[PDB]
Design a binder for this molecule. Structure first.
Ligand SMILES: O=C1C[C@H](c2cc(Cl)c(O)c(Cl)c2)Oc2cc(O)cc(O)c21
Ligand SMILES: O=C1C[C@H](c2cc(Cl)c(O)c(Cl)c2)Oc2cc(O)cc(O)c21
Lengths: 115, 115, 115, 115
């Protein structure tokens, strides 16, 4: 599993469940092309986004639909979504965990990169 | 000052000085049109981005060039930039401070809305 | 102002107003003696904690009563308080801002040291 | 596993490995009594701190020795340690994941509480 995303809710102290997200990869014409998508499970995790052969060098963007998550909870959030943009696999294949911690008016994101 | 941006550096415990950023506003055709830009000051703050008359309701994106900041310090960064996408809604007199705390492999952002 | 504390609320997107906190300094006998205290203002800031003559090198603890803050808003919090324990070292003229961003089940803190 | 701690390094984008920590529980005489301790593994995780029968209602403190972690990496950090203080099991047994993300001048902590 070369790319996994974990999302937590800082208000309820719980995984952020059923959070949608879309992964895009920058194309040659400098447009964002759809690469993968999914929703977080009961543990707040999204696995199986991609495979090692498909996940090539490039610039990728992970768009986490945080607005829809807060609104299904009755809260009106500040952000429309949380975006994470990074270059992947520039020095060879790595495993990437993108983690995000969400509040109505704030979020934090970090990456764990393993070889 | 209806919109201000403050950037801090979590590695050096200081304001993030000379950080470039661009502000975009969403267009009806689903494209980001340039709205404002600048570079943070010695206090890590960017003021005078916009005026009360120009800052209307809508979806705005702040793209902070974190990669150039870390490269200038000699530190290998994870993200291409830090993006903050938010809705500005008119409900009472609101001033927005967008604040961001930066690390090479992580960032956090929050909004301080006040009257 | 050699030491200032700023507290923000990540749920309401505002400064954390009327937050009580105590500052302790480590004693030779490994006990925390009271040093200063106060409550954050409408800007979420607590100024005038100490003077340059009193703020000597040492280990200091800032204990922020986050539990009372969340209870006042009607929100069930995880932490009893937020604690920030740090060394103040003399190397050039240093002013310390301790900043904290609060959520019910999470908090983040950073130091902004400047000249 | 009713209490687990996960620690990440925001500068290197990696688990924080071999981070020591000490868990204390508040006693009747309002002193902190030693409850459990360990070091994070290669994945940045500390499991096996306690058992469900031993982990009773009370106020617990988790002291993560962040200073020693940064110094074994050649960095001089701001904080002496990261402390997390919370009431556990007040409404019956829960499972607790305390997570921390570390920078030299900053850290964030959050809790996931499951039933
Ligand atoms: O801890 C802080 C405080 C920091 C801040 C500092 C100062 Cl001095 C200030 O005036 C304002 Cl508005 C904000 O903002 C943050 C943004 C963030 O995403 C996570 C954080 O932990 C913080
Ligand atoms: O963004 C994250 C997610 C990170 C995390 C990563 C993994 Cl892999 C994991 O299993 C768990 Cl429980 C938490 O924890 C955090 C702790 C924190 O103080 C601030 C954060 O932003 C985060």
């Amino acid at each position: 599993c070369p790319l996994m995303v974990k999302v937590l809710d800082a208000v309820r102290g719980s995984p952020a469940i059923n959070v949608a997200m879309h992964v895009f990869r920058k194309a040659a014409d400098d447009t964002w092309e759809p690469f993968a998508s999914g929703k977080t499970s009961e543990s707040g995790e999204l696995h199986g986004l991609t495979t090692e052969e498909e996940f090539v060098e490039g610039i990728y963007k992970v768009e986490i639909d945080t607005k829809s998550y807060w609104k299904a909870l009755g809260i009106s959030p500040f952000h429309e979504h949380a975006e994470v943009v990074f270059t992947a696999n520039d020095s060879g294949p790595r495993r990437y965990t993108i983690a995000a911690l969400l509040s109505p008016y704030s979020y934090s994101t970090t990456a764990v990169v393993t070889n």
